[PDB]
Amino acid sequence: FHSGGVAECEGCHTMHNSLGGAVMNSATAQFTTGPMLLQGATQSSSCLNCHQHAGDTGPSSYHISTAEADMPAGTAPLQMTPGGDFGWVKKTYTWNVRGLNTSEGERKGHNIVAGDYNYVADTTLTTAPGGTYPANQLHCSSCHDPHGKYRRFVDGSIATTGLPIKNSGSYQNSNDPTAWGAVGAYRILGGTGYQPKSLSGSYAFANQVPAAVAPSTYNRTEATTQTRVAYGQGMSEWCANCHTDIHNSAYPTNLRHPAGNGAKFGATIAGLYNSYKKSGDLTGTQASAYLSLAPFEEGTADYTVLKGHAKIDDTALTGADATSNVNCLSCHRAHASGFDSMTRFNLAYEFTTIADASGNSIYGTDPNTSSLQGRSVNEMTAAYYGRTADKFAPYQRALCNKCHAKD
Amino acid sequence: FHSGGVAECEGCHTMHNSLGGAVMNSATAQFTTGPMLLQGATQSSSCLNCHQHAGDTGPSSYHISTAEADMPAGTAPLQMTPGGDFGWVKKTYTWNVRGLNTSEGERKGHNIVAGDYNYVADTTLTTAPGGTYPANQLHCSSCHDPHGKYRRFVDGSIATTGLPIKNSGSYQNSNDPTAWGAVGAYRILGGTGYQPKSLSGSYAFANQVPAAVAPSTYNRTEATTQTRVAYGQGMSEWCANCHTDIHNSAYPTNLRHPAGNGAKFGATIAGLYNSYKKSGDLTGTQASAYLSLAPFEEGTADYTVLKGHAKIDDTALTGADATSNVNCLSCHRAHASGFDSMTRFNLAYEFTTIADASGNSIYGTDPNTSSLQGRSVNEMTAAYYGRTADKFAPYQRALCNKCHAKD
Ligand code: HEC
Ligand code: HEC
Ligand code: HEC
Ligand code: HEC
Ligand code: HEC
Ligand code: HEC
Ligand code: HEC
Ligand code: HEC
Ligand code: HEC
Ligand code: HEC
Ligand code: HEC
Ligand code: HEC
Incomplete structure (x- = not known):
């Protein structure tokens, strides 16, 4: 559809809301289209009309959210992207240990605005924490560039114009940009000047598009092999481009957890990343010890090495480096995670698992517990992208001790 | 929260000092956290933000200090732990018998550093008496391990890694360490190599974590039954691990009061411990004669016997043994005592009580006396953990004649 840049130009837009007499999208009546001539009531329904295919038997191809008619109150959202499902924003859990605990769905993701799909905007976070960016204006075109104008050339520069776009910058089986044609940006997100016309403020992006290489055929379970995304240089600065006061390139002179190009691993931290396998099983290696739940920047922009370190198979499970950096997106999955x-x-209980009597592991036996937190064992399994009770310690503590071994 | 080891990992730390837009701890402004990313101005406010619940009607659950808004100048701190309240460090008493006497609050406890709770560091004791350990650096993580790394295995060995942690080593209704999972240390204190990263000296712990079994539901008055803590082997050496020149395993070849594994009771001393009930009432027995104000090591590490001799009820008031040792923590309650x-x-006046005219006992009638020392009778009662004028002799001398009968 997109193929690096702008797409089938009626795929998202519509001109008269009519094609063969029929309404092109029933959210608005015929002979009136909607906002910015799009197919939908908002700027995100024109994304969610072929993304979010209603009716799924697993994470299929490129979809990023699951229809509400597919999920009851007993199952998890069923698409596993590196961004995660937006269906997690409509999950409010109530477990009743020593009182009650409400884990509402507002806090689980970017509440995009989509009236026909009941994606209500975030009510508690009225603006972005770090900047002045509104949450009643956040759409899918608010951080992605829907036209995909941003290119990359043979010298790795990124420009809004010049040589035309031939394919996507992600997907390691892509092509290199030539002297006659450019390759589009990684996951066509805007940068260094991007602002939608629908915004009436000084909300211009001032950070470049993040260099990374995602793997093709990425919607998968991770019970067997892990999804390695290259995450090269500018992911933390791009997340800082709208959450201004959050990133931290200098630790400590800000007293925030470091995230940026200057947020290097120590030689101590990189050894603790490579050693950690489970709780107390500090026997890991440089190679064959990687966790997608805590990635790192590997802070170069050499796309040959980035396509080398981007594989669906386990042939590229290299661990940390002393010169490796810290992502924003190390923790915080991009779209929503639940x-x-x-x-x-899972940072609301002290160990993420339960050992059942003869000591193998489970996630729990009951939603009304403190360890499992008002959900099924299948929903917690799918929240870890199909990672079952094994690959973890039986009483494994919170997974952000990966690169400190504070166990 | 902790459950033997490291906890809900945002329970003490914070990453951006923001959650739902609001500041996670108002001692530091938003988008800057504090020292070591903790919730508070110091490393102890991140302990005292859910410990020390402001507003109490007695020793409730697990709290260790009382808020200053709960105590006037007429009442005592209201939590009775085996460590004692840190509120006692802010009690300066002035009684005017034949001049005046100032019993300042610096001398009553470890002055931890907490700027938001006005716990000022100790000014007279600049360092630890016995070592070179500073008092301007003492925090709750300075003698406890805040991550609780130290484990114990099925063979009673203690290691920093190996099998993961499932629960606390204290609390006699705990579980035994299995071949698949370890039990955390007694009262998660560090040992044999513990040193915080915030210290820039050679202050490494070289003594093991003390073997003991504390009783569950311990915050209580002791007007009815006593709180028996097992206190097994290494409490005196652990207190010696930072107060180096103080402990004494060989008496006399040091001329200090003995405290250690080699500081055994004599057959004379163990009989004097069992005989002492009140002043002059030297009629006690082996069983049914124990005082929590003067415990002993019972110097084994058999945790079955230690959980046997750890009971909130009076079913385990066994007295001394000829092979029993002397704690540090026999005198010197651990946190603070007042x-x-x-x-x-009470070692500032010769007898701890007063007989009122027809000879029952009181603690006094007036703070401006020598027997009661500038405090209420209720504050002296709560300083003895709710022990009233009875259970004592009417003119009972200083309680450290328990195991000598030097009355
Ligand atoms: C100028 C006054 C007119 C009139 C009378 C019509 N158009 Fe358009 N049109 C455009 C595109 C891309 C489509 C197909 C997809 C869509 O509707 O968005 C159409 C469709 C129509 C139809 C119906 C055809 C059908 O199959 O039902 C009719 C009757 C029609 N148009 C009439 C594109 C454009 C424009 C592109 C910017 C312009 C201008 C117009 N049309 C203008 C007109
Ligand atoms: C409106 C509902 C949409 C749709 C249809 C998509 N997005 Fe996003 N997206 C964002 C970021 C930072 C990434 C890259 C994360 C990573 O690579 O680890 C993505 C990725 C995607 C993909 C590719 C699948 C993937 O996980 O890589 C797709 C198909 C996709 N998006 C579609 C950022 C954002 C937002 C930032 C606040 C917003 C809103 C959206 N995306 C919205 C949408
Ligand atoms: C990389 C540059 C970023 C950005 C833009 C954000 N984070 Fe974090 N974050 C983490 C945790 C554990 C929390 C919740 C508790 C806490 O704040 O300590 C958060 C919270 C946020 C928010 C606000 C959410 C809210 O409910 O108010 C925002 C806007 C935010 N983050 C942005 C954890 C981490 C990390 C773990 C080591 C990493 C790295 C980052 N975040 C990085 C970023
Ligand atoms: C910062 C204000 C804290 C907090 C919240 C706690 N401590 Fe301590 N502690 C120390 C020792 C040697 C013990 C065991 C004493 C015994 O078992 O007899 C304890 C015990 C505790 C407990 C359990 C309650 C109890 O009395 O057993 C709790 C909840 C607790 N602590 C919390 C030693 C120290 C210190 C040594 C100089 C420092 C400082 C602190 N603790 C600080 C704190
Ligand atoms: C880089 C991909 C980013 C990460 C990681 C996060 N963001 Fe955002 N963000 C924006 C707004 C207007 C909000 C409030 C709306 C809402 O919360 O639904 C947020 C919110 C978050 C949150 C908190 C989610 C919660 O409700 O608890 C997190 C953890 C978060 N964001 C991480 C705006 C933007 C934005 C503007 C165009 C960008 C590029 C990003 N955010 C990027 C990231
Ligand atoms: C085993 C639990 C211990 C007992 C019993 C005592 N300590 Fe300490 N200690 C340390 C410092 C730096 C000081 C000076 C700071 C201050 O006094 O507030 C102290 C002080 C004491 C005191 C005197 C209190 C007074 O002001 O009169 C006593 C009676 C005492 N300590 C008993 C340091 C440390 C430490 C370093 C990490 C450890 C493990 C201990 N102390 C342990 C014990
Ligand atoms: C609303 C304006 C959006 C946004 C923000 C995105 N899409 Fe789609 N999309 C479609 C298909 C078939 C693919 C895979 C094939 C391909 O990428 O060429 C995608 C992929 C994406 C991506 C990933 C691109 C990358 O470089 O990896 C992104 C970021 C994306 N989309 C965003 C199909 C449709 C479609 C109807 C056929 C509609 C409408 C949209 N997409 C709308 C949007
Ligand atoms: C600051 C880093 C600290 C330190 C040094 C300690 N805590 Fe807590 N604590 C909390 C709760 C609910 C309990 C009882 C339940 C349980 O122990 O699992 C405790 C208990 C302790 C202990 C005793 C442990 C033992 O093995 O007996 C100790 C030594 C201790 N704490 C030290 C709750 C909190 C909490 C917020 C919910 C905060 C923050 C802390 N604790 C912080 C600290
Ligand atoms: C889906 C991937 C789209 C395709 C294909 C095209 N457009 Fe688009 N457009 C899309 C969105 C989600 C928005 C809203 C942005 C906002 O400001 O809210 C737009 C907007 C426009 C605009 C408005 C001005 C601007 O955004 O700067 C114009 C003029 C526009 N689009 C033109 C346009 C053309 C010519 C396209 C085909 C070659 C085209 N769009 C395709 C989503 C999508
Ligand atoms: C409260 C009980 C805490 C929890 C839960 C976690 N941490 Fe912690 N941490 C805590 C304190 C009081 C301190 C200060 C120690 C000092 O040196 O002053 C720390 C410190 C750290 C550090 C610094 C390095 C070090 O102390 O050796 C790191 C890297 C750290 N903490 C990591 C960490 C992780 C990964 C945690 C969750 C799994 C975690 N901490 C929880 C208190 C508490
Ligand atoms: C992919 C790496 C990564 C993960 C995930 C991560 N951290 Fe860290 N953390 C680091 C690095 C690198 C440092 C900097 C160490 C240094 O400066 O010596 C650091 C520093 C810290 C510090 C300050 C320590 C110091 O020495 O000053 C704290 C506290 C901390 N992290 C907490 C956390 C918490 C809590 C989590 C779980 C939410 C977490 N981290 C997850 C990599 C990580
Ligand atoms: C729980 C036991 C315990 C308590 C409490 C205790 N002592 Fe002792 N004390 C002992 C033991 C055991 C010895 C060693 C006796 C021996 O070596 O024969 C001893 C020895 C002594 C000695 C040396 C006696 C000798 O024979 O050499 C003195 C003096 C002394 N203690 C004073 C005190 C004082 C003063 C207090 C009150 C602060 C006190 N003790 C509290 C147990 C205790």
Whole structure:
């Protein structure tokens, strides 16, 4: 559809809301289209009309959210992207240990605005924490560039114009940009000047598009092999481009957890990342010890090495480096994850698992517990992207001790 | 929260000092956390933000200090732990018998550093008496391990890694360490190599974690039954691990009061411990004669016997043994006690009580006396953990004649 840049130009837009007499999208009546001539009531329904295919038997191809008619109150959202399902924003859990605990769905993700799909905007976070960016204006075109104008050339520069776009910058089986044609940006997100016309403020992006290489055929379970995304240089600065006061390139002279190009691993931290396998099983290696729940920047922009370190198979499970950096997106899965702060981690209880009597592991036996937190064992399994009770310690503590071994 | 080891990982730390837009701890402004990313101005406010619940009607659950808004100048701190309240460090008493006497609150406890709770560091004791350990650096993580790394295995060995942690080593209704999972240390204190990263000296712990079994539901008055803590082997050596020159395993070849594994009771001393009930009432027995104000090591590490001799009820009031040792923590309650040298004893006046005219006992009638020492009778009662004028002799001398009968 997109193929690096702008797409089939009626795929998202519509001109008269009519094609063969029929309404092109029933959210608005015929002979009136909607906002910015799009197919939908908002700027995100024109994304969610072929993304979010209603009716799924697993994470299929490129979809990023699951229809509400597919999920009851007993199952998890059924698409496993590196961004995660937006269906997690409509999950409010109530478990009754020593009182009650409400883990509402507002805190689990970016509440995009989509009236026809009941994606209500975030009510508690009225603006972005860090900047002045509104949450009643956040759409899918608010951080992605829907036209995909941003290119990359043979010298790695990124420009809004010049040589035309031939394919996507992600997907390691892509092509290199030539002297006659450019390759589009990684996951066509805007940068260094991007602002939608629908915004009436000084909300211009001032950070470049993040260099990374995602793997093709990425919607998968991670019970067998892990999804390695290259995450090269500018992911933390791009997340800082709208959450201004959050990133931290200098630790400590800000007293925030470091995230940026200057947020290097120590030689101590990189050894603790490579050693950690389970709780107390500090026997890991440089190679064959990687966790997608805590990635790192590997802070170069050499796309040959980035396509080398981007593989669906386990042939590229190299661990940390002393010169490796810290992502924003190390914790905080990008779209939504279902863990009350959009993080990849269960941080509301002290150990993420339960050992059943003869000591193998489970996630629990009952939603009304403190360890499992008002959900099924299948929903906690799918929240860890199909990672079952094994690959973890039986009483494994919170997974953000990966690169400190504070166990 | 902790459950033997490291906890809900945002329970003490914070990453951006923001959650739902609001500041996670108002001692530091938003988008800057504090020292070591903790919730508070110091490393102890991140302990005292859910410990020390402001507003109490007695010793409730697990709290260790009382808020200053709960105590006037007429009442005592209201939590009775085996460590004692840190509120006792802010009690300066002035009684005017033949001049005046100032019993300042610096001498009554470990002055931890907490700027938001006005716990000022100790000014007279600049370092630890016995070592070179500073008092301007003492925090709750300075003698406890805040991550609780130290484990114990099925063979009683203690290691920093190996099998993971499932529960606390204290609390006699705990579980035994299995071949698949370890039990955390007694009262998660560090040992044999513990040193915080915030210290820039050679202050490494070289003594093991003390073997003991504390009783569950311990915050209580002791007007009815006593709180028996097992206190097994290494409490005196662990207190020696930072107060180096103080402990004494060989008496006399040091001329200090003995405290250690080699500081055994004599056959004379163990008989004097069992005989002492009150002043002059030397009629006690082996069984049914125990005082929590003067415990002993019972110097084994057999945790079955230690959980046997750890009971809130009076079913385990066995007295001394000829092979029993002497704690540090026999005198000197651990956190703070309010007796000008952190001891469990009133050692500033010759008899701890007053007989009122027809000879029953009181603690006094007036703070401006020598027997009651500038405090209420209720504050002296709560300083003895709710022990009233009875259970004592009417003119009972200083309680450290328990195991000598030097009355
Ligand atoms: C100028 C006054 C007119 C009139 C009378 C019509 N158009 Fe358009 N049109 C455009 C595109 C891309 C489509 C197909 C997809 C869509 O509707 O968005 C159409 C469709 C129609 C139809 C119906 C055809 C059908 O199959 O039902 C009719 C009757 C029609 N148009 C009439 C594109 C454009 C424009 C592109 C910017 C312009 C201008 C117009 N049309 C203008 C007109
Ligand atoms: C409106 C509902 C949409 C749709 C249809 C998509 N997005 Fe996003 N997206 C964002 C970021 C930072 C990434 C990259 C994360 C990573 O690579 O680890 C993505 C990725 C995607 C994909 C590719 C699948 C993937 O996980 O890589 C797709 C198909 C996709 N998006 C579609 C950022 C955002 C937002 C930032 C606040 C917003 C809103 C959206 N995306 C919205 C949408
Ligand atoms: C990389 C540059 C970023 C950005 C833009 C954000 N984070 Fe974090 N975050 C983490 C945790 C554990 C929480 C919840 C508790 C806490 O704040 O300590 C958060 C919270 C946020 C928010 C606000 C959410 C809210 O409910 O108010 C925002 C806007 C945010 N983050 C942005 C954890 C981490 C990390 C773990 C080590 C990493 C790295 C980052 N976040 C990085 C970023
Ligand atoms: C910062 C204000 C804290 C907090 C919240 C706690 N401590 Fe301590 N502690 C120390 C020792 C040697 C013990 C065991 C004493 C015994 O078992 O007899 C304890 C015990 C505790 C407990 C359990 C309650 C109890 O009395 O057993 C709790 C909840 C607790 N602590 C919390 C030693 C120290 C210190 C040594 C100088 C420092 C400082 C602190 N603790 C600080 C704190
Ligand atoms: C880089 C991909 C980013 C990460 C990681 C996060 N963001 Fe955002 N963000 C924006 C707004 C207006 C909000 C409030 C709306 C809402 O919360 O639904 C947020 C919120 C978050 C949150 C908190 C989610 C919660 O409700 O608890 C997290 C953890 C988060 N964001 C992480 C705006 C923007 C934005 C503007 C165009 C960008 C590029 C990003 N955010 C990027 C990231
Ligand atoms: C085993 C639990 C211990 C007992 C019993 C005592 N200590 Fe300490 N200690 C340390 C410092 C730096 C000081 C000076 C700071 C201050 O006094 O507030 C102290 C002080 C004491 C005192 C005197 C209190 C007074 O002001 O009169 C007593 C009676 C005492 N300590 C008993 C340091 C440390 C430490 C370093 C990490 C450890 C493990 C201990 N102390 C342990 C014990
Ligand atoms: C609303 C304006 C959006 C946004 C923000 C995105 N899409 Fe789609 N999309 C479609 C298909 C078939 C694919 C895979 C094939 C391909 O990428 O060429 C995608 C992929 C994406 C991506 C990933 C691109 C990358 O470089 O990896 C992104 C970021 C994305 N989309 C965003 C199909 C449709 C479609 C109807 C056929 C509609 C409408 C949209 N997409 C709308 C949007
Ligand atoms: C600051 C880093 C600290 C330190 C040094 C300690 N805590 Fe806590 N604590 C909390 C709760 C609910 C309990 C009882 C339940 C349980 O122990 O699992 C405790 C208990 C302790 C202990 C005793 C442990 C033992 O093995 O007996 C100790 C030594 C201790 N704490 C030290 C709750 C909190 C909490 C917020 C919910 C905060 C923050 C802390 N604790 C912080 C600290
Ligand atoms: C889906 C991937 C789209 C395709 C294909 C095209 N457009 Fe688009 N457009 C899309 C969105 C989600 C928005 C809203 C942005 C906002 O400001 O809210 C737009 C907007 C426009 C605009 C408005 C001005 C601007 O955004 O700067 C114009 C003029 C526009 N689009 C033109 C346009 C053309 C010419 C396209 C085909 C070659 C085209 N769009 C395709 C989503 C999508
Ligand atoms: C409260 C009980 C805490 C929890 C839960 C976690 N941490 Fe912690 N941490 C805590 C304190 C009081 C301190 C200060 C120690 C000092 O040196 O002053 C720390 C410190 C750290 C550090 C610094 C390095 C070090 O102390 O050796 C790190 C890297 C750290 N903490 C990591 C960490 C992780 C990964 C945690 C959750 C799994 C975690 N901490 C929880 C108190 C508490
Ligand atoms: C992919 C790496 C990564 C993960 C995930 C991560 N951290 Fe860290 N953390 C680091 C690095 C690197 C440092 C900097 C160490 C240094 O400066 O020596 C650091 C520093 C810290 C510090 C300050 C320590 C110091 O020495 O000053 C704290 C506290 C901390 N992290 C907490 C956390 C918490 C809590 C989590 C779980 C939410 C977490 N981290 C997850 C990599 C990580
Ligand atoms: C729980 C036991 C315990 C308590 C409390 C205790 N002592 Fe002792 N004390 C002993 C033991 C055991 C010895 C060693 C006796 C021996 O070596 O024969 C001893 C020895 C002594 C000695 C040396 C006696 C000798 O024979 O050499 C003195 C003096 C002394 N203690 C004073 C005190 C004082 C003063 C207090 C009150 C602060 C006190 N003790 C509290 C147990 C205790």
